[PDB]
Structures are given as C-alpha cells and as structure tokens.
Amino acid sequence: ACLPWSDGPC
C-alpha cells in the first residue's frame, strides 16, 4: 500500500 510521503507503485 503506497506510502503517504512516498506513495510509489500502488
């Protein structure tokens, strides 16, 4: 699950 400050490849 993508990160808040580092979403990335969801």
Report on the architecture of this protein.
The chain is mostly loops. Helix content is 0%, strand content 0%. It has no helices and no strands.
Set down the secondary structure blueprint.
Elements: no helix or strand
Proportion of beta-strand residues: under 5%
Rounded radius of gyration (Å): 5 Å
Q: How much helix, percentage-wise, in residues?
A: under 10%
Give me the count of strands.
0
> In terms of structural class, how would the helical and strand content be classed?
little secondary structure
Tally of helical segments: 0
> Main sheet, how many strands, which sense, barrel?
none
Basic shape: flat
Give the terminus-to-terminus CA distance: 6 Å
PDB class: de novo protein
Keywords: gibberellin, mimic, STD-NMR, DE novo protein
Assembly: monomeric
Entry title: NMR structure of peptide SD
TL;DR?
It is classed as de novo protein. The chain has 10 residues and is mostly loops. 0% of the residues lie in helices and 0% in strands.
Which features would summarize this protein structure in a list?
10 residues; mimic; de novo protein; little secondary structure; gibberellin
